[PDB]
């Protein structure tokens, strides 16, 4: 199943596999983190946890939610040093869309340009292919809300509900039973069904100081990050 | 591992912070202490621990009490006991394992 | 083995050892602590007197990047002052292009992306330094950041890097840095680095302190002699 | 930075390029896909199963157009495909800016396969892990070509790529003749993709694109449901 | 599980033999007392203490752990 | 040891072995001792030869009128940093029309030699520069090392068998900040007779002295003008 330096660099195994990429997928799992994204009928919600183990650390500088453009937000998993470098590219690629083409970049075209860059790392046998993932949300005209994931292999797809991190398979098994019964989704139900995803997988039943929620909706297309006070409003209504 | 011979596959995992609170209170029974024990802060640093090393924390907190002849256990000796156990398992292997 | 020679290869469980091996080189440098007060940041470095032949004021582990930004380093000293040169040069390009003094959330962002850039290729090694950045502005207050050799930065109310890291930050959270001004902090900065480093390992050592805030009128400079003599007067009262 | 500037693909002592032989193993483990030309147009049909019900199937596409009259499918790994699509999109433009004419389908495969050969000799790169099927109707007569990661190409009447491709080629050999219409070739392309799919072949588990003399186009899932109905 | 001494012919047990130890375990036992003293070990006085007090204190002050009440390490 | 091949590779203990092997190169060259008073900076070297008819290899070099250096290691990398040293002094004199300060010169060397200690296929510079000079702040003694780590000091000694010279400098450095040029030199000359075998010491053809002084340009003394300094030393006690 191995011959040559196929364990070390990005070349083909005798089985057709290539191991340096599928080693990098489980470099995401060393963060100890899990993020959930849910698309609604007229909105898009990202929820993720934050774990602050110290009192000496400033809790306002640990946000994994990042604002890419004025109308595009994202969440980052994996290791922190590679994830913040990939946000810096996505800020740069969106500004060049506006300068060259004169209008706001669609969120699927931005995920294509990130996945094309990540392809080149697993295409040359020199670079290390950036072991961190990527989840974007955004409102598109004549498409509504839409959610995309980009992995460090260069693959991407549009989702309807999304999990990434340590507890990915347990969260998606919860969500696929939720979506196929096909209830209609208001704004607050998508907030409710996203918090109760990682509250039943992780079994926490938390207070509002450990999670962070970004949202976009077609009445205010600005990507906005919720205050902990209004996080608490959805949380005490979740406990009926 | 065929389902004819072994039927169910019960999985036991690393304890949660509720369980780490629960396991700590069982091993902290017969400890001559003073009632200022914030049990959360011990659980706050207790990450990825076992059920076994929480008995060690209760064991090693008395090992700070065994010096300077304090027959009582101050609350400060617990946060000394956590940080010494916390880096002694830096040299572990940490592979979970899965039945296949 | 063979999976840990270059920084371009992951391990078969998905982590890079050349960064972890360079993180181990930091805990052989001694100790650098820095906490921020209510209205400023105070650094502190205990300096090992290796032999009598060196001069008092040699080989300072406490740099001066910009007019208001300070740096305290810990690691392989040749890589310390090499990172200090690009950070000193990065702030010069900000003032020349944008007109004003660089903020810390941008300065530590540009440096950490420069440190991260050497954790990807086989042609270069990771740095063997971790360091702290602290400053004061009249429009933003006091800031305090810290950068590991992987390239991760966060905000802190107080941090510690060196040999005894946990044994230093255990006593930092005994303080109350939210309300103290940067005068009584100077006595408390020195005291927590006398209780560390038993006299069996080192014979004699040197105190070196730093200081920034509006009491210093925004400029970064060293403490005066008389103030650090008060802290060295406040040295030998920890024997009770 | 810089590169490596040495070929990591060498000759074996038995005289075989081993990395190209391994790249064909990754092609054979891809999704199955068939392609059939019959006397007025070419049918390209593939097999696209999402792993779960959470995926949006109307987001990505296997069947891609290159120009007004050239489509292109694959059977291999995903991210390598989108690279040489964007390469082949550009190569059709530099032919058009010189000659003011849509590119012949033969001359596109001359230049796409020249990229893949150039990429298996140069320094510090692993070869591609995809094989292609290219259709098009230039000057009345249709065309159907297949490339490979080595850089060669062929001129097929009907062929299959992906898993169980050796069973599809026996199935097409007992099915295809010289005289079929386009709607007959659609019906036998679904009949050969049913050899290897799961139990449910719905309107969104497959993806079909055709050429005419009216040009290349890609079928919507409405009439794909009508072709999937009254099948097998 | 016991092992006893039996007559040959009658198969009638006579005595009760004490122990069952392999001879290699008897070679594992010291009887020589290799004399070394703590002054001969320089530069380990942190490790010397926490090795002794984690072993010798449960062998000479058993009640001292039991006064507080913990299991010893 | 597979961690022992290239400068890029970290050890699992975190100590790059190629830097530590260049420290072995500076320990091969002969000893030299530098020290300073309040107003002077004197460095004394000890030459070697191959046969008795070949000449002795010089070590003290002239960088500028107020800066001189002393080398230890392989001589080819010494001239590589020496021609960098001379170039950085006279262009600052070309631009600003002033002597370039010593403490600002050495930081250019520390950034110069750190670059090949991080790339791939690039050796470090095996060299042993002791630097003596004048700022506007009086004398300065600086030493470097192939780990690109320069040290501010008041008396140091590097080369083969130099630990014996350092023990002499520690128990007499309380006297150094008072004396004139005469017994400042022969304080340092008593350090070089410490680092020798017990039969040959100072035979006026293997020792060199360089002084920069508060009204004195940097001057090298070689094998005839050494003899006024070298007389006035007592015999070796045995």
From Swiss-Prot, chain A:
Keyword Phosphoprotein among record annotations: yes
Compartment(s): Cytoplasm; Nucleus
GO cellular component, one term: mitochondrion
Gene Ontology molecular function: endopeptidase activity; NF-kappaB binding; purine ribonucleoside triphosphate binding; RNA binding
SMART domains reported in the protein's UniProt record: Proteasome_A_N
Residue positions, PTM Phosphoserine: 13, 59-60
First-listed, main subcellular location of the protein, grouped into a coarse class: cytoplasm
Keywords from the UniProt entry: Acetylation, Cytoplasm, Glycoprotein, Nucleus, Phosphoprotein, Proteasome
InterPro entries: Ntn_hydrolases_N (IPR029055), Proteasome_alpha (IPR050115), Proteasome_alpha-type (IPR023332), Proteasome_asu_N (IPR000426), Proteasome_sua/b (IPR001353), Proteasome_subunit_alpha6 (IPR034642)
Residue(s) carrying N6-acetyllysine: 98, 100
Modified residues (Phosphotyrosine): 155
GO biological processes: positive regulation of canonical NF-kappaB signal transduction; proteasome-mediated ubiquitin-dependent protein catabolic process; proteolysis involved in protein catabolic process; regulation of inflammatory response
Quaternary structure (record): The 26S proteasome consists of a 20S proteasome core and two 19S regulatory subunits. The 20S proteasome core is a barrel-shaped complex made of 28 subunits that are arranged in four stacked rings. The two outer rings are each formed by seven alpha subunits, and the two inner rings are formed by seven beta subunits. The proteolytic activity is exerted by three beta-subunits PSMB5, PSMB6 and PSMB7. Interacts with ALKBH4.
Record-stated family: Belongs to the peptidase T1A family.
NCBIfam families: PRK03996.1 (NF003075)
Full protein name: Proteasome subunit alpha type-6
Native source species: Homo sapiens
Curated annotation (Swiss-Prot), chain C:
Record-listed N6-acetyllysine modification sites: 52, 201, 225
Disulfide bridges in this chain: none
One GO cellular component, as annotated: proteasome complex
Entries under PROSITE patterns matching the protein: PROTEASOME_ALPHA_1, PROTEASOME_ALPHA_2
SMART domains for this protein: Proteasome_A_N
Gene Ontology terms: biological process: proteasome-mediated ubiquitin-dependent protein catabolic process
UniProt keyword list: Acetylation, Cytoplasm, Host-virus interaction, Nucleus, Phosphoprotein, Proteasome
Subcellular location: Cytoplasm; Nucleus
Recorded superkingdom: Eukaryota
SUPFAM superfamilies in UniProt: N-terminal nucleophile aminohydrolases (Ntn hydrolases)
Induction statement: Down-regulated by antioxidants BO-653 and probucol. Up-regulated by bacterial lipopolysaccharides (LPS) and TNF.
InterPro entries in alphabetical order: Ntn_hydrolases_N, Proteasome_alpha, Proteasome_alpha-type, Proteasome_asu_N, Proteasome_sua/b
Pfam families per the UniProt record, alphabetical: Proteasome (PF00227), Proteasome_A_N (PF10584)
MF annotations from Gene Ontology: ubiquitin protein ligase binding
Sites of Phosphoserine modification: 238
Subunit details: The 26S proteasome consists of a 20S proteasome core and two 19S regulatory subunits. The 20S proteasome core is a barrel-shaped complex made of 28 subunits that are arranged in four stacked rings. The two outer rings are each formed by seven alpha subunits, and the two inner rings are formed by seven beta subunits. The proteolytic activity is exerted by three beta-subunits PSMB5, PSMB6 and PSMB7. Interacts with AURKB. Interacts with CDKN1A. Interacts with MDM2 and RB1. Interacts with the C-terminus of TBXA2R isoform 2. Interacts with DNAJB2. (Microbial infection) Interacts with HIV-1 Tat protein.
Record family assignment: Belongs to the peptidase T1A family.
Curated annotation (Swiss-Prot), chain E:
Coiled coil: none
Compartmental location: Cytoplasm; Nucleus
Source species, domain of life: Eukaryota
The record's account of how the chain is modified after translation: Sumoylated by UBE2I in response to MEKK1-mediated stimuli.
UniProt record similarity statement: Belongs to the AAA ATPase family.
Primary role: Component of the 26S proteasome, a multiprotein complex involved in the ATP-dependent degradation of ubiquitinated proteins. This complex plays a key role in the maintenance of protein homeostasis by removing misfolded or damaged proteins, which could impair cellular functions, and by removing proteins whose functions are no longer required. Therefore, the proteasome participates in numerous cellular processes, including cell cycle progression, apoptosis, or DNA damage repair.
Disease the record associates with this protein: Deafness, cataract, impaired intellectual development, and polyneuropathy: An autosomal recessive disease characterized by early onset of deafness, cataract, severe developmental delay, and severely impaired intellectual development. Patients later develop polyneuropathy of the lower extremities, associated with depigmentation of the hair in that area.
Protein name: 26S proteasome regulatory subunit 6A
Swiss-Prot record, chain F:
Gene3D superfamilies noted in UniProt: Glutamine Phosphoribosylpyrophosphate, subunit 1, domain 1 (3.60.20.10)
The keyword Glycoprotein belongs to this UniProt entry's keyword annotation: yes
Cross-link (Glycyl lysine isopeptide (Lys-Gly) (interchain with G-Cter in ubiquitin)), chain numbering: 112, 205
Phosphoserine: residues bearing it: 107, 174
Principal location class: cytoplasm
PROSITE patterns membership: PROTEASOME_ALPHA_1, PROTEASOME_ALPHA_2
Entries under InterPro entries matching the protein: Ntn_hydrolases_N (IPR029055), Proteasome_alpha (IPR050115), Proteasome_alpha-type (IPR023332), Proteasome_alpha1 (IPR035144), Proteasome_asu_N (IPR000426), Proteasome_sua/b (IPR001353)
Subunit and partners: The 26S proteasome consists of a 20S proteasome core and two 19S regulatory subunits. The 20S proteasome core is a barrel-shaped complex made of 28 subunits that are arranged in four stacked rings. The two outer rings are each formed by seven alpha subunits, and the two inner rings are formed by seven beta subunits. The proteolytic activity is exerted by three beta-subunits PSMB5, PSMB6 and PSMB7. Interacts with NOTCH3. Interacts with ZFAND1.
Similarity annotation: Belongs to the peptidase T1A family.
Name the UniProt record assigns to this protein: Proteasome subunit alpha type-1
Lineage, opening ranks: Eukaryota, Metazoa, Chordata, Craniata, Vertebrata
Gene that encodes it: PSMA1
């Amino acid at each position: 199943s191995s011959a040559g330096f196929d364990r070390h660099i990005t070349i083909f195994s005798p089985e057709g596999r290539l191991y340096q990429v599928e080693y990098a997928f489980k470099a995401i799992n060393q963060g100890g983190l899990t993020s959930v994204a849910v698309r609604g009928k007229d909105c898009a919600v990202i929820v993720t946890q934050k774990k602050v183990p110290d009192k000496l650390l400033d809790s306002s500088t640990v946000t994994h939610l990042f604002k890419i453009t004025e109308n595009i937000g994202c969440v980052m998993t994996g290791m922190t040093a590679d994830s913040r470098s990939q946000v810096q590219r996505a800020r740069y690629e969106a500004a060049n869309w506006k300068y060259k083409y004169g209008y706001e970049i669609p969120v699927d075209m931005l995920c294509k340009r990130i996945a094309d860059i990540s392809q080149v790392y697993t295409q040359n046998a020199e670079m290390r292919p950036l072991g961190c993932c990527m989840i974007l949300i955004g409102i598109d005209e004549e498409q509504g809300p839409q959610v995309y994931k980009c992995d460090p292999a260069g693959y991407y797809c549009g989702f309807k509900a999304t999990a990434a991190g340590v507890k990915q398979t347990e969260s998606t098994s919860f969500l696929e039973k939720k979506v196929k019964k096909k209830f209609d989704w208001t704004f607050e139900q998508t907030v409710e069904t996203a918090i109760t995803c990682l509250s039943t997988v992780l079994s926490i039943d938390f207070k509002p100081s450990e999670i962070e929620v970004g949202v976009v909706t077609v009445e205010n297309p600005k990507f906005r990050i919720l205050t902990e006070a209004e996080i608490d409003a959805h949380l005490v209504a979740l406990a009926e | 591992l065929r389902p004819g011979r072994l039927d169910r596959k019960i999985h036991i995992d690393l304890p949660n912070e509720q369980a780490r609170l629960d396991i700590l209170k069982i091993h902290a029974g017969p400890i001559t202490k003073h009632g200022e024990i914030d049990y959360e802060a011990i659980v706050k640093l207790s990450d990825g621990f076992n059920g076994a090393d929480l008995r060690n924390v209760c064991t090693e907190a008395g090992m700070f009490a065994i010096r300077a002849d304090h027959d009582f256990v101050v609350q400060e000796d617990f946060m000394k006991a956590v940080r010494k156990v916390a880096d002694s398992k830096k040299l572990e292997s940490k592979l979970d394992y899965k039945p296949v | 083995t063979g999976y840990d020679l270059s920084a371009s290869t992951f391990s078969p469980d998905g982590r890079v050892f050349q960064v972890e091996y360079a993180m181990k080189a930091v805990e052989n440098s001694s100790t650098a602590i820095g906490i921020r007060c209510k209205d400023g940041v105070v650094f502190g470095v205990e300096k090992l007197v290796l032999s009598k032949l060196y001069e008092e004021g040699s080989n300072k582990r406490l740099f001066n990047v910009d007019r208001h930004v300070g740096m305290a380093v810990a690691g392989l000293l040749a890589d310390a002052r090499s990172l200090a040169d690009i950070a000193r040069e990065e702030a010069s390009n900000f003032r020349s292009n944008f007109g004003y003094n660089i903020p810390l959330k941008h300065l530590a962002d540009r440096v950490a992306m420069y440190v991260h850039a050497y954790t990807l290729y086989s042609a270069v090694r990771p740095f063997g330094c971790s360091f702290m950045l602290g400053s004061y502005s009249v429009n933003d207050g006091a800031q305090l950041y810290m950068i590991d050799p992987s390239g991760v930065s966060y905000g802190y109310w107080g941090c510690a890097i060196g040999k005894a890291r946990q044994a230093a930050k255990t006593e930092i959270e005994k303080l109350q840095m939210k309300e103290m001004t940067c005068r009584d902090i100077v006595k408390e900065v020195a005291k927590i680095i006398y209780i560390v480093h038993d006299e069996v390992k080192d014979k004699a050592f040197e105190l070196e302190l730093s200081w920034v805030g509006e009491l210093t009128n925004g400029r970064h400079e060293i403490v005066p002699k008389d103030i650090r003599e008060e802290a060295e007067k406040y040295a030998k009262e920890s024997l009770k | 930075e810089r590169g490596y500037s040495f070929s990591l693909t060498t000759f074996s002592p038995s005289g075989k390029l081993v990395q190209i032989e391994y790249a064909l193993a990754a092609v054979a483990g891809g999704a199955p896909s068939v392609g059939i030309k019959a006397a007025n147009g070419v049918v390209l049909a593939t097999e696209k199963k999402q792993k779960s019900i959470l995926y949006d199937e109307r987001s990505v596409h296997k069947v891609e157009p290159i120009t007004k009259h050239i489509g292109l499918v694959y059977s291999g790994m995903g991210p390598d495909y989108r690279v040489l699509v964007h390469r082949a999109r550009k190569l059709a433009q530099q032919y058009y800016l010189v000659y003011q004419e849509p590119i012949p389908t033969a001359q596109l495969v001359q230049r796409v396969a020249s990229v893949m050969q150039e990429y298996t000799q140069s320094g510090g790169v692993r070869p591609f892990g995809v094989s292609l099927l290219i259709c098009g109707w230039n000057e009345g007569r249709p065309y159907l070509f297949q490339s490979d990661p080595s850089g060669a190409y062929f001129a097929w009447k009907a062929t299959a790529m992906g898993k169980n491709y050796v069973n599809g080629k026996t199935f097409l050999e007992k099915r295809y003749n010289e005289d079929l219409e386009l709607e007959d070739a659609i019906h036998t392309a679904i009949l050969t993709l049913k050899e290897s799919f799961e139990g449910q072949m719905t309107e969104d588990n497959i993806e079909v694109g055709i050429c005419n003399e009216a040009g290349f186009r890609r079928l919507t899932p409405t009439e794909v449901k009508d072709y999937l109905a009254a099948i097998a | 599980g016991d092992l006893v001494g039996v007559n040959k012919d009658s198969y009638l047990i006579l005595e009760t033999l004490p122990t069952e130890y392999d001879s290699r375990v008897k070679a594992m036992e010291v009887d020589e007392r290799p004399t070394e003293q703590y002054s001969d070990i320089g530069g380990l006085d942190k490790q010397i203490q926490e090795l002794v007090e984690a072993i010798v204190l449960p062998m000479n002050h058993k009640e001292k752990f039991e006064n507080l009440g913990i299991q010893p390490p | 040891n597979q961690y022992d091949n290239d400068v890029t590779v970290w050890s699992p203990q975190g100590r790059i072995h190629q830097i530590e092997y260049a420290m072995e190169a500076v320990k091969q060259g002969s000893a030299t001792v530098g020290l300073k008073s309040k107003t002077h900076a004197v460095l004394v070297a000890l030459k070697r030869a191959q046969s008795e008819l070949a000449a002795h290899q010089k070590k003290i070099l002239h960088v500028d009128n107020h800066i001189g250096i002393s080398i230890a290691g392989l001589t080819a990398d010494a001239r590589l940093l020496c021609n960098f040293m001379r170039q950085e002094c006279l262009d600052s004199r070309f631009v600003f029309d002033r002597p370039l300060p010593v403490s600002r010169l050495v930081s250019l060397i520390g950034s110069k030699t750190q670059i090949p200690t991080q790339r791939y296929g690039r050796r470090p510079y095996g060299v042993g520069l002791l630097i003596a000079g004048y700022d506007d702040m009086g004398p300065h003694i600086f030493q470097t090392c192939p780990s690109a780590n320069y040290f501010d000091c008041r008396a140091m000694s590097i080369g083969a068998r130099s630990q014996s010279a350092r023990t002499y400098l520690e128990r007499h450095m309380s006297e150094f900040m008072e004396c004139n040029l005469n017994e400042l030199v022969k304080h340092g000359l008593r350090a070089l007779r410490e680092t020798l075998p017990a039969e040959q010491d100072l035979t006026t053809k293997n020792v060199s002295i360089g002084i920069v002084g508060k009204d004195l340009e940097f001057t090298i003394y070689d094998d005839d003008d050494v003899s006024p300094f070298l007389e006035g030393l007592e015999e070796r006690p045995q």
